[PDB]
Design a protein around this ligand. Structure first.
Ligand SMILES: N[C@@H](Cn1c2c(c(=O)[nH]c1=O)COC2)C(=O)O
Ligand SMILES: N[C@@H](Cn1c2c(c(=O)[nH]c1=O)COC2)C(=O)O
Ligand SMILES: [Cl-]
Ligand SMILES: [Cl-]
Ligand SMILES: [Li+]
Ligand SMILES: [Li+]
Lengths: 263, 263
């Protein structure tokens, strides 16, 4: 049949996808800006398709309910045919790979520790051995699931701590986690993807930093429904953009070129 | 039909695949040791297959001759049906992805600079601006091809330098590049994959180091013939091993646990 406009699912998460300041004056894809907005346009240009950016209805990345077996988030939108492609900071994981297709990574990263400057923590092991400095994750997504599923002693101990700590150490959004670090006088450390930690470190008021090495290594991938014809071309586009240096330029654009915390 | 033993193609490259010191006493897969030997065994265990390690006949990773259109190296062995899987430090690239299937990365890396300690170089830009300190790559493989194909100004200038420099700045093997760094009194710098640079930095006589950031970001993948049924299971195995922390343990085993240059 004739070509159709490709439905892209994504999520509002700075600096990946944001509504422009003047969005009310604008329409369609032009209402949005960010790393993933630019990436979507580059992929579409390379693959020769028209597309529509849509925002995932339930605000989630993607997980399967153990009782109903239903997939939520952007993964669910692909699984159930509501979107054709997901372009977002979506981690490639085994359980997702079983149900959707993923490109090779467009960004390599790991779980990391964000502290308020001056907090006496240098590693996950440091956090695990104490409780005075509380620590936690988003309440949904691959960072939380890493701890929940880990059989590594330090990370299992951290998960047991997080489930039992009071008040709750979980946050609903990145913005809430960052604000909690900033307002807690050194008594909250936030576990988050290194990409995001690096971005926030270059935002005013310049009071956070990434400490220690990453806890894992992984990647974000562009996702399509399993077996979708679009997957091959999208994957080749990711590889081409990487090989041309354009993914590095895009990260610099959104993370560092207008960083707010000096040079 | 009945299950058959899987033919693995690999390449002798320390610390990925090496003949054991006592190999003449041994037979079959047990003659070999290294990171990729251990990885092959883990993948086979997870996927439930028996396998035979074989060494690529032509000693190459994989490229296509522009005139004959023939693929060489491990890629060629897959393309032409001589092997079922390649398990090696094989870079995921666009041109290879078009002809073979790749798992998600089992190791993330980039091109990097190896210097003899004390060489006054900190970046690729530093190298590009001078000729007193000669610099080059392997004479085959993805590092060489990165420079040959680059449209980035610094790297294009470096390639033009490398093609025209005398004596030849290219080397046939990693061992030759390392020996050339070590014997050239600071007047040769070697461009190589960061993984390998990190390994050599922990080998006696402890006279080399990695300097500067990496020039690119990419990954090694397990490769199978395009459309091979084995690809799905192998990819899931890579993701599982990564998520369990086993790939990190394997790198530590072969790079750092018995490093020769201190703690
Ligand atoms: N990438 C994750 C979602 N996620 C995200 C951030 C984080 O600190 N931890 C996560 O789990 C920051 O941006 C997204 C997924 O795919 O579930
Ligand atoms: N990974 C490359 C081959 N390669 C390799 C090393 C290097 O410094 N540069 C390369 O090009 C070290 O070990 C392999 C390929 O797949 O062609
Ligand atoms: Cl349409
Ligand atoms: Cl057989
Ligand atoms: Li998948
Ligand atoms: Li491929």
């Amino acid at each position: 049949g004739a070509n159709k406009t490709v439905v892209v699912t994504t999520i509002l998460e700075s600096p990946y996808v944001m509504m422009k300041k003047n969005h009310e004056m604008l329409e369609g894809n032009e209402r949005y800006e960010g790393y993933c907005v630019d990436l979507a346009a580059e992929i579409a240009k390379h693959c020769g398709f028209k597309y529509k950016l849509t925002i995932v209805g339930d605000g989630k990345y993607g997980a399967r309910d153990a009782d109903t077996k239903i997939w939520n988030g952007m993964v669910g939108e692909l699984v159930y045919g509501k979107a054709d492609i997901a372009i977002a900071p979506l981690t490639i994981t085994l359980v997702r790979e079983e149900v959707i297709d993923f490109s090779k990574p467009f960004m390599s990263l790991g779980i990391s520790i964000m502290i308020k400057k001056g907090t006496p923590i240098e590693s996950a092991e440091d956090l695990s051995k104490q409780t005075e400095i509380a620590y936690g994750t988003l309440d949904s997504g691959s960072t939380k699931e890493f701890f929940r599923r880990s059989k590594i002693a330090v990370f299992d101990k951290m998960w047991t701590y997080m489930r039992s700590a009071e008040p709750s150490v979980f946050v609903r959004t990145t913005a809430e986690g960052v604000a909690r670090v900033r307002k807690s006088k050194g008594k909250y450390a936030y576990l988050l993807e290194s990409t995001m930690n690096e971005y926030i470190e270059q935002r005013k008021p310049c009071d956070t930093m990434k400490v220690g090495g990453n806890l894992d290594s992984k990647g974000y991938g562009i996702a399509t429904p399993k077996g979708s014809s679009l997957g091959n071309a999208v994957n080749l586009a990711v590889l081409k953009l990487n090989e041309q240096g354009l993914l590095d330029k895009l990260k610099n654009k959104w993370w560092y070129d207008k960083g707010e915390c000096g040079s």
